[PDB]
Amino acid sequence: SLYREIHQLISFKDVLPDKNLLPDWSSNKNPCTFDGVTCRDDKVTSIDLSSKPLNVGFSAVSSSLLSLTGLESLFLSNSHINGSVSGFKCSASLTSLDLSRNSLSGPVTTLTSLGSCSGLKFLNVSSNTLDFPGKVSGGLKLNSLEVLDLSANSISGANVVGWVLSDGCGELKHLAISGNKISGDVDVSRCVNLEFLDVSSNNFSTGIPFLGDCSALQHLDISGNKLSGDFSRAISTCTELKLLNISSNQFVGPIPPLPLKSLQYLSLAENKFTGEIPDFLSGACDTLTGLDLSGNHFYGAVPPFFGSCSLLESLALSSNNFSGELPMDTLLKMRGLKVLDLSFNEFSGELPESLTNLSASLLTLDLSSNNFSGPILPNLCQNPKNTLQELYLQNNGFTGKIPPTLSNCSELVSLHLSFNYLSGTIPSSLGSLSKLRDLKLWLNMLEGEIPQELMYVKTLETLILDFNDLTGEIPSGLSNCTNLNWISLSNNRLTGEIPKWIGRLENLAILKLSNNSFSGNIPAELGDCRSLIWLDLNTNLFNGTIPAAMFKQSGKIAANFRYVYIKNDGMKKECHGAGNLLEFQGIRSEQLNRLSTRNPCNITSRVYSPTFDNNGSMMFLDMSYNMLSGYIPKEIGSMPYLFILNLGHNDISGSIPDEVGDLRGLNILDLSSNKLDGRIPQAMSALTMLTEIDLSNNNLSGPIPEMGQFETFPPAKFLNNPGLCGYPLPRCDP
């Protein structure tokens, strides 16, 4: 017996490709001492080899492990098991089998073989590649199961649920098959003990699941399909219902009657429900902990009855047309509230003083994209121990100043005050927000300098201050913020140079400094930013030459890195640069016209990516409209991910490096308005991704390369080059 146990386990170990995996599994040694093994009274009862790259087929598993007498559970989640299940001798003692997150493949009918495990009651085969080929007939025939998870497979087809349940489901308590492409009907009316049903993210577009008496159902998730019928009538017999998730479908009309007496979580998000919030929902106030109505067509006010929902932790009403003043009278009674999301509505008026009390309970306050006005509450975080982590007030009409008292929201992780009409300075006291990761204040009328005090915020990742009236230089304090990964200061009136300490921000992925008055040379230390993929310096007063060293990472960039990209059309003179990459969270695109008084560019063309290992490269480089000079370092050509390169409008001379032809990712290439001479390198015919080029206003000569993409570009892209010829230009005179 021990003999048999140890021979089975060691035989399993020996079939493993990796010889480091079960280092302590050893023959002539008791398995009860092995890692991965659970024993009771010196007998093996469970094996857990999850998250270990075994790289063997199911046949090895069923041969060795599943035949172990007395084995009660086997956990092999994320263990690189492949192959298919099939017939094997299986212990009567085995009650749970977890094969999730593997590479099991073949028709789901293979699972019928697990019927040989007479004791099997729990089965997880989620996140594999099981499918259902053609004719959906017969049955799964595992009607002893209490729990079955077939989620995230490759099951495509109609009435697969009927197939799962055809042979009986009187024992079933938990059915999940989410994340497939199943369609048709769901009939669980004979599953009288079913407590959990998840058919979400599938291809259901016809009937609502038929639940029958719905006598044990507590959790119902049909979200992420295309359903439109009468779910209300479907769930009306479900008196045990705690979670109802019908989000991301195609339901319409007003919120219908619902079974409210046991309800904890309700989501109707992402449908087309209309009307006001009806007062009958009040019946769930004894139990309701989470409510989500986001992304519908609701309107009107927030009903006073919400005052009695004392257990409500989360109220999400974003993206509707709710209106009126902040219903503080009601919000104050919601003892339990931690998340309040009213963003993307039409709430208006000023912030009430009572709101300050909420700083004491909420973790998240989201009022972004409404019609609020007036000052931001000076006293907001006045309470002894405020919990507030996220404060989103962006895209409103707030006036006045940023209250220094926000330094008292001690747990603040994210502060978004962008797209308002705030004036005054950036309070130095935000320096004492020791956990702050995101500071976003762009598109306001902020003045003064960038607080040196930010140097106290070690956690800082995001500093977005575009479109203000900020002056002075980049404070050396920012050098201490080594987790900065996104710095954006475009469209201020800043001065001075890029500090060389810039080099020691190994996480900086985006540096946008356009339309200021920065000067001096480009620091070669820029090449020491191990994360830099987006460098925008257009429209400044930079000078000197381009440092080859700034490219010395093209390189071992580990990985890649919520925004809007607004492309410059090329029909406006006063509009400079390839285009603006701007932070765009909780902001309506409709309000982008608010830039009209700051930005000479049109705003019509709004846009919202590769994968790296250690191959990653700079993706975006724009240094146009400066006073640069010298020669383009041929290292310029070392960036296979560079899809944009704008060096237009400088005083760059010498010839175009042939290495430019190595930039296989290049879509845009602007080198117009410079002192460039010599021949356009033939190598540039290798580029096949170009959508725009400009080499006009240089001193280029010789023929335009006959191959590549040149012929597809108009004469304009080549004008003002005396000795240049060849189509699209006039034929060269040999």
Ligand X SMILES: *[C@@H]1O[C@H](CO)[C@@H](O[C@@H]2O[C@H](CO)[C@@H](O[C@@H]3O[C@H](CO)[C@@H](O)[C@H](O)[C@H]3NC(C)=O)[C@H](O)[C@H]2NC(C)=O)[C@H](O)[C@H]1NC(C)=O
Ligand Y SMILES: *[C@@H]1O[C@H](CO)[C@@H](O[C@@H]2O[C@H](CO)[C@@H](O)[C@H](O)[C@H]2NC(C)=O)[C@H](O)[C@H]1NC(C)=O
Ligand Z SMILES: *[C@@H]1O[C@H](CO)[C@@H](O[C@@H]2O[C@H](CO)[C@@H](O[C@@H]3O[C@H](CO)[C@@H](O[C@@H]4O[C@H](CO)[C@@H](O)[C@H](O)[C@H]4NC(C)=O)[C@H](O)[C@H]3NC(C)=O)[C@H](O)[C@H]2NC(C)=O)[C@H](O)[C@H]1NC(C)=O
Q: If contact means CB under 5 to 8 A according to the sort of partner, which of ligand NAG, ligand Y, ligand X, none does residue 455 touch?
A: ligand NAG
Rounded to whole angstroms, the Cα distance separating 592 from 394 reads: 13
Rounded to whole angstroms, the Cα distance separating 703 from 706 reads: 8
Q: Which of these ranges, 119-127, 346-354, 619-627, 725-733, lies near ligand X under the rule CB under 6 A? A: 119-127
Under rule CB under 6 A, residue 675 binds ligand Y: no
Of 716, 706, 713, nearest in space to 684 by CA:
706
Rounded to whole angstroms, the Cα distance separating 511 from 65 reads: 54
Q: If contact means CB under 5 to 8 A according to the sort of partner, which of ligand Y, ligand Z, ligand X, none does residue 101 touch?
A: ligand X
Under rule CB under 6 A, residue 245 binds ligand X: no
In this structure, the dihedral spanned by the alpha carbons of residues 590, 596, 600 and 604, taken in order and rounded to 10 degrees, is 20
Under rule CB under 6 A, residue 434 binds ligand NAG: no
Of 119, 172, 124, 170, nearest in space to 145 by CA:
172
Under rule CB under 6 A, residue 539 binds ligand Z: yes
3-class DSSP assignment, residue 702: strand
Q: If contact means CB under 5 to 8 A according to the sort of partner, which of ligand Y, ligand NAG, ligand Z, none does residue 223 touch?
A: ligand Y
Among 520, 610, 723, 730, binds ligand Y (CB under 6 A): 520
Which secondary-structure segment (H or E) carries 174? strand 174-176
Q: What are phi and psi of 298, to 5 degrees?
A: -70, 160
Under rule CB under 6 A, residue 101 binds ligand X: yes
Token pair in block for residue 671: 């080198």
Under rule CB under 6 A, residue 576 binds ligand Z: yes
CB of 470 to ligand Z, least distance (A): 11
Under rule CB under 6 A, residue 626 binds ligand Y: no
Which residue number, 224 or 616, has a Cβ lying nearer to ligand Y? 224
Kindly tell me the number of DSSP H helices and DSSP E strands found in the chain: 6, 49
Which secondary-structure segment (H or E) carries 63? helix 58-64
Cβ neighbours for 233, distance < 8 A, ≥ 6 positions apart: none
Binding pattern for the stretch 305-324 against ligand NAG, x by CB under 6 A and - elsewhere: ----------------x-x-
CB of 435 to ligand Y, least distance (A): 24
Q: If contact means CB under 5 to 8 A according to the sort of partner, which of ligand Y, ligand NAG, ligand X, none does residue 248 touch?
A: ligand Y
Which residue number, 20 or 597, has a Cβ lying nearer to ligand Z? 597
Which residue number, 633 or 648, has a Cβ lying nearer to ligand Z? 648
CB of 588 to ligand NAG, least distance (A): 12
Which secondary-structure segment (H or E) carries 28? none
Which residue number, 468 or 674, has a Cβ lying nearer to ligand Z? 468
Under rule CB under 6 A, residue 375 binds ligand NAG: no
Q: What are phi and psi of 209, to 5 degrees?
A: -50, 135
Under rule CB under 6 A, residue 598 binds ligand Z: yes
Strand 510-512 relative to strand 486-488, pairing: parallel
Is residue 599 classed exposed, middle or buried when 0-12, 13-18 and 19+ CB atoms within 10 A define those classes? buried
CB of 153 to ligand X, least distance (A): 12
Question: Residue 567: beta bridge partners?
Answer: 579
Cβ neighbours for 568, distance < 8 A, ≥ 6 positions apart: 575, 576, 577, 578, 579, 601
Binding pattern for the stretch 488-507 against ligand Z, x by CB under 6 A and - elsewhere: ---x----------------
Q: Does 608 carry a binding-site annotation?
A: yes
Among 232, 387, 521, 685, binds ligand Y (CB under 6 A): 521
Binding to ligand NAG (CB under 6 A): which residues in 167-186? none
Would you tell me which residues interact with ligand Y (CB under 6 A)? 156, 181, 183, 200, 203, 205, 221, 223-224, 245, 247-248, 265, 267, 519-521, 543-544
Q: Residues marked as binding for brassinolide?
A: 563, 608-609, 667
